[PDB]
Design a protein around this nucleic acid. Structure first.
Ligand SMILES: Cc1cn([C@H]2C[C@H](O)[C@@H](COP(=O)(O)OP(=O)(O)OP(=O)(O)O)O2)c(=O)[nH]c1=O
Ligand SMILES: Cc1cn([C@H]2C[C@H](O)[C@@H](COP(=O)(O)OP(=O)(O)OP(=O)(O)O)O2)c(=O)[nH]c1=O
Ligand SMILES: Cc1cn([C@H]2C[C@H](O)[C@@H](COP(=O)(O)OP(=O)(O)OP(=O)(O)O)O2)c(=O)[nH]c1=O
Ligand SMILES: [Mg+2]
Ligand SMILES: [Mg+2]
Ligand SMILES: [Mg+2]
Ligand SMILES: [Zn+2]
Lengths: 412, 500, 474
DNA sequence: TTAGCTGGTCATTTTTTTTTTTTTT
RNA sequence: ACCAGC
């Protein structure tokens, strides 16, 4: 709690400087309420005042999402140029003010903030719905512990360093504990190699096991970062358009077409799998110039354990075929990685040797008493994942990766 | 509270409109929201406009939530602040202007607070004394943490805070921001923080607003009263260590070997028989403190007036006897040599005089604080004590010791002796004891140094005095200090060479 | 305000009470009902006389306000008319408690209620002396609060003795014990209640545990500088007043600061000093050199030398390493509040009150003697209630003839200055005498209440180079 | 003809009795 | 509508 009150008292004395420095630059104006006027001032949190003040300072948007208004976000507040060299520096302060406002409203001032769900013993209890999405993915609520800022966003490490497992001093020796975090690698991208291995005879599920996939994909597609390559590959895979994967590099629809052709002509089995799904589910789709009228044949899909997975739209069928089969292997893995630990001779809970703390969509965070217990957990997670991969006869080879640390900033 | 999304109708969106449990909807795209005087000023009558304050810094939503609205009645600008109750109804108002002409309308109770109608449960509370600091703390914390404020000033702290006792009892930590005090609140719960400016607004308008928010979340505990521990004195014990030098007595060096002079906060009692030369020794000590060390000296002679002691000082510095010679007074008034003696003494205005029991201490306090004197000399305390005289002289000595303490001023006091019971007289050569002081027995308990003079006017040598230290609370050495011989021609009592 | 509200003209209805725990049968029996006037439902209770005629309404809202419709007497009880005798009554405090008790007994024992509560219970019990004479046992059932205990203590005086019994409850009153399922305890407190025990009187038989634990804990706290002082007085104890006297400048403060040093260093007790002869800058300054066996303020050459070499911080750390010294700087009402804050909050065990002659002469009073007596008895009451070692310093007065007290005069016990109750309410009187051999000081124990041996206790010498009080031989 | 799955944000004139000083018979 | 998460 102290390490987040220090953060709140730090960056609550920054948005009270980014408005003082900014209202003297962007002045006030009379706005019509005999003509009744009022003296309204510049509010940077609004996306109308910035739109007006950039409209009357010499900027043309050339991007019209709304029918009479432009779009204003972080990707057009970078590519904006004005004549006055003061406003060119003021726009960066506007973006920093919006970031600080979102940080404050998430951390400490919201209705569902972190400091309004801390119990007497210094712990946060958040509800986790195991089946909240239509594809078997768990949802997190009151508060959401799967939505805190990562280590790549600004003020991210200072927000994840408070959510540690070394803040629990032991009740019998007065010592802090150790945290182990285990993440699966290439989960839905390896489920794809499971599902299409009957088409290309299994010569795609061998390159995934031969070295890292996203690093060599970044090498092959000359993306700047591994995170951008990882965003791009699933953006291409889950049915994008001509522009929404050219926007990842910022280029035009020419590059947005040639990247689709380059990653479609490598393995010509994704289109065959998509045609198989279309021939299995849908039978006829009448076209309307503003809508779509479809006569269905099977609205549901059998999952990995017979569950009728519901399909919302016929172009998200590959999505609800991949992620609904990817969530269930993690859901069995989190069960088996304690069914082996209890049978190994340990004790679950705070008065034992280990305790689960949070389960976000891919990785698990467990906190344990000694480093040898951490090593036992980080060993048996692999055996649990391999038993999951053997129980359902996957054509791939599943594998994870674990880290050890004091808090959830090294164990990300 | 947020429930789910409905499709909006004005903008035609799909998942823009959000429904709530209170019955109202809100769209995030089209931004459309759905659903004295003893006279309370009506909002539709007084032309109520929620304008903002530019020169101090207050947003519009803060004035809409707190109820601090500008009226445009009578062609002028009034600032009406509203007080409410726990049910949320208008009880009283305050109409404030540029001339601060307060017009408190309605039923203004003794326990009214500003901002108690929105905030009833929580953990921490910040209490201020005005309204502008309350709005400043709400601007810093974005109107979401419990802040209340008083309604009768900082002088009704024993009445307003005491009447509201079950209201403040619901909160866990009560933080005060009055002045940079009341104990009626329950103990172990009250925190008081310190800011480098007068209030919170002078910290907000000058860049110290961060130091506001650091004093809210980490406010220190309440020390109850002026008692201190033995660790917070650590610098001041150093500071008094680097201050404390004794003012040396002249005429004899035997005193300074066993008295160490005079220090700050030091009442020194001087006595002898009836007419044995107290005023001569005190006047010589006054001259040697005035013209030789640069200390500003304030006399308060009550026996004689200003002109006598002025002429005696002028005659005494020039090694002569001024008033005891008509020929010298007739001489120095003709040739104009008097200003040569006046300017060499009173050039750097070190001397201040008094022209003759509660107004006298006020005049001494004005002489100490306003003018800046360092050594105050009184004389002949028997007039000031002229009901029961023991109680008067005890209260007088207590007030003089209280004035000398915590100021750092040397205070020289002259007293006499009573009639002896048997034996011979004090003026004929009787050795004086410590319990010979008249008026009470309180003069020897509050005096930090007692000096007595003895001489024999009808003996063989009527100009050889004996100095006797009766009490010394600093060193503890008493007895005969030395011998001094009085001059019949120059008025200078000087260190002699006789041994008894 | 107008008149007695009729139930027809106010839409009355006799129903149950769900959130309180009272059924409709008991409300039908008593006459507690609900009217509908001014839109908001208002509950109303009925007052009757001894005959049975309606004399008053009592109207309560949804926000707990009171409203009397007319003449409100003091001899009117809520629940009195139904019974005209019996062998056992139960008197409550509020008004719902009567319904609570008559709910759980099916109207078998007479239960009455008070018309004012606990604030004006003595007035409504003094005028109701004649109604309780026809009864045999009375069980008072009040709140378990401070006002409830005060009302049950002050209301049992005007009642007849031998019949008033007081019951205790684990709840606030009977209603929370009705709600929380504690219906087995309130039925035993009616039939078997506590007998007479007013506060102030203690039986000699029921005092075994306090006398057992009292001789177990305090005692000790030896003096310093001499042996005969502990041979005669056996140290200083909790709840006593030790009064040290001398003349003028005879060493009445040096001995006390030496004892404070020995009791703050060698034994680890929290010591609270109230020095009024000097400021806080001096009384915390001489302790440094006194612990380092020198005279600090009495030498100007050593002060600069301990400023320069940094040894002053070492001397401050080796003495004040613990929080064992609490100072005070300078009406007579707030000083005892400071002493209560030193005793209850901080936890001091030795409190020194130096130079008392400037807290009785600095206050504006016509008569000094009554102020000295009141201050002394209130200070003794404080030291007896809290039980703290308290040293007080006072002075002597002028002798009638002979020598002076500052030259070796043997002091008597009537030489205490100011009054004659300074020796009647003090528990030990120690006098220090010397003659200016300027350092041979003798100690006279004038009065000891614990032991009996008085007189000459010993001799000491004051060191002019270090500052300690050394024992001598003579 | 479409990257996908979630969460979180917001607005209205005389008596009697202790105690401290100081003349003189 | 904006941000954040996997
Ligand atoms: C980034 C991203 C991942 N996913 C999927 C991919 C995974 O199956 C799951 C979590 O993604 P990640 O854990 O971020 O990626 P990864 O597991 O494939 O790679 P690595 O652990 O080696 O760093 O969610 C999306 O559906 N949309 C997305 O935008
Ligand atoms: C010191 C001294 C003074 N004198 C003279 C000079 C003084 O002016 C004169 C007495 O004048 P003061 O000194 O003024 O007399 P005093 O102050 O002692 O007594 P008090 O004020 O109560 O009346 O005595 C001597 O004859 N022999 C001496 O030794
Ligand atoms: C007892 C004694 C004290 N002294 C010195 C020490 C101190 O400087 C001074 C007495 O110390 P203090 O305790 O300050 O004097 P005091 O308390 O008796 O006086 P007061 O009634 O005004 O409070 O005398 C001796 O020289 N020899 C001694 O035998
Ligand atoms: Mg992963
Ligand atoms: Mg004189
Ligand atoms: Mg003293
Ligand atoms: Zn809309």
């Amino acid at each position: 709690t102290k390490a987040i009150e220090e953060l709140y008292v730090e960056l609550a004395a920054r948005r009270s400087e980014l408005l003082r420095k900014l209202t003297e630059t962007f002045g006030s104006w009379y706005q019509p309420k005999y003509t009744p006027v009022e003296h309204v001032v510049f509010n940077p949190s609004s996306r109308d005042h910035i739109q007006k003040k950039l409209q009357e300072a010499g900027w043309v948007p050339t991007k019209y999402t709304d029918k009479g208004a432009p779009v204003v976000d972080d990707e057009v507040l970078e590519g904006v140029r004005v004549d006055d060299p003061e406003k060119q520096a003021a726009i960066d302060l506007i973006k920093e003010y919006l970031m600080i406002q979102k940080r404050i409203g998430q951390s400490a001032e919201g209705d569902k903030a972190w400091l309004r769900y801390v119990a007497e013993d210094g712990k946060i209890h958040g509800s986790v719905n195991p089946n909240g999405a239509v594809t078997g993915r768990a949802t997190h609520a009151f508060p959401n512990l799967a939505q805190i800022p990562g280590v790549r966003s600004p003020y991210g490490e200072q927000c994840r360093a408070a959510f540690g497992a070394e803040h629990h001093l032991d009740g019998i020796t007065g010592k802090p504990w150790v945290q182990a975090g285990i993440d699966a690698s290439g989960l839905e991208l390896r489920c794809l190699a499971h599902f299409m291995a009957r088409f290309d005879n299994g010569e795609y599920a061998h390159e995934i096991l031969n070295g890292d996939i996203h690093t060599k994909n970044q090498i092959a597609a000359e993306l700047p970062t591994r995170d951008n390559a990882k965003t791009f590959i699933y953006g291409f895979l889950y049915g994008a358009g001509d522009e929404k994967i050219g926007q990842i590099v910022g280029a035009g629809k020419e590059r947005g077409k040639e990247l689709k052709k380059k990653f479609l002509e490598n393995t010509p089995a994704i289109a065959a799998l998509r045609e198989s799904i279309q021939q299995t589910l849908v039978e006829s789709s009448q076209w309307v110039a503003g809508e779509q009228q479809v006569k269905w044949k099977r609205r549901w899909i059998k999952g990995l354990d017979g569950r009728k997975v519901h399909v919302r739209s016929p172009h998200a069928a590959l999505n609800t075929l991949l992620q609904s089969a990817g969530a269930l292997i993690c859901k069995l893995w989190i069960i088996k990685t304690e069914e082996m630990l209890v049978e190994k001779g340990l004790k679950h809970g705070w008065d034992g040797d280990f305790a689960y703390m949070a389960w976000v969509h891919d990785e698990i965070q467990v906190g344990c008493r000694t480093e040898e217990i951490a090593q036992v957990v980080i060993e048996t997670a692999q055996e649990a994942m391999r038993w999951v991969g053997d129980h359902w006869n996957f054509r791939c080879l599943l594998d994870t990766e674990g880290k050890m640390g004091p808090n959830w900033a090294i164990c990300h | 509270v947020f429930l789910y999304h409905i499709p909006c109708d004005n903008c035609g969106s799909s998942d823009g409109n959000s429904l709530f449990s209170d019955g109202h909807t809100f769209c995030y795209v089209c931004e459309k929201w759905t659903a004295m005087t003893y006279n309370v000023w009506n909002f539709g009558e007084s032309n109520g406009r929620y304008s903002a304050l530019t020169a101090r810094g207050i947003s519009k939503e803060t004035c809409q939530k707190a109820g601090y609205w500008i009226a445009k009645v009578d062609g002028v600008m009034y600032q009406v602040a509203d007080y409410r109750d726990q049910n949320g109804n208008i009880v009283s108002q305050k109409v404030r202007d540029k001339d601060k002409n307060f017009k408190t309308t309605g039923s203004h109770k003794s326990d009214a607070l500003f901002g108690k109608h929105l905030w009833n449960g929580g953990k921490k509370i910040v209490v201020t004394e005005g309204e502008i600091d309350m709005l400043t703390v709400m601007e810093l914390q974005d109107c979401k943490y419990p802040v209340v404020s008083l309604g009768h000033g900082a002088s009704a702290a024993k009445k307003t805070c005491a009447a509201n006792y079950e209201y403040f009892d619901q909160f866990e930590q009560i933080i005060l921001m009055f002045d940079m005090a009341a104990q009626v609140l329950p103990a172990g719960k009250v925190r008081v923080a310190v800011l480098p400016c007068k209030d919170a607004n002078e910290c907000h308008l000058n860049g110290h607003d961060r130091e506001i928010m650091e004093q809210v979340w980490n406010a220190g505990p309440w020390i109850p009263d002026g008692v201190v521990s033995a660790l917070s004195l650590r610098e001041r014990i150093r500071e008094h260590l680097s201050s404390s030098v004794g003012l040396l007595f002249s005429g004899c060096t035997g005193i300074n070997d066993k008295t160490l002079g005079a220090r700050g906060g030091e009442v020194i009692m001087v006595t002898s028989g009836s007419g044995m030369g107290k005023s001569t020794f005190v006047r010589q000590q006054a001259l040697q403190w005035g013209t030789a060390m640069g200390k500003k000296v304030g006399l308060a002679m009550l026996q004689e007036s200003v002109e006598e002691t002025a002429e005696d000082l002028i005659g005494l510095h020039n090694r002569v006897r001024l008033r005891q010679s008509d020929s010298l007074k007739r001489e120095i008034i003709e040739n104009g040599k008097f200003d040569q003696w006046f300017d060499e003494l009173f050039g750097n205005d070190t001397f201040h005089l008094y022209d003759s029991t509660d107004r006298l201490l006020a005049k001494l306090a004005y002489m100490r604080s306003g003018l800046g004197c360092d050594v105050i000399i009184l004389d002949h305390i028997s007039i000031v004590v002229s009901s029961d005289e023991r109680k008067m002289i005890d209260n007088l000595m207590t007030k003089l010791k209280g004035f000398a303490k915590s100021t750092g001023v040397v205070l020289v006091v002259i007293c006499h002796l009573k009639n002896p019971d048997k034996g011979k007289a004090h003026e004929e050569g009787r050795p004086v004891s410590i319990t010979d002081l008249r008026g009470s027995g309180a003069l020897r308990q509050l005096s930090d140094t007692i000096i007595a003079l003895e001489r024999n006017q009808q003996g063989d040598m009527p100009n050889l005095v004996l100095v006797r230290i009766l009490k010394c609370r600093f060193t503890g050495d008493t007895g005969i200090a030395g011998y001094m011989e009085y001059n019949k021609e120059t008025g200078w009592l000087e260190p002699s060479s006789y041994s008894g």
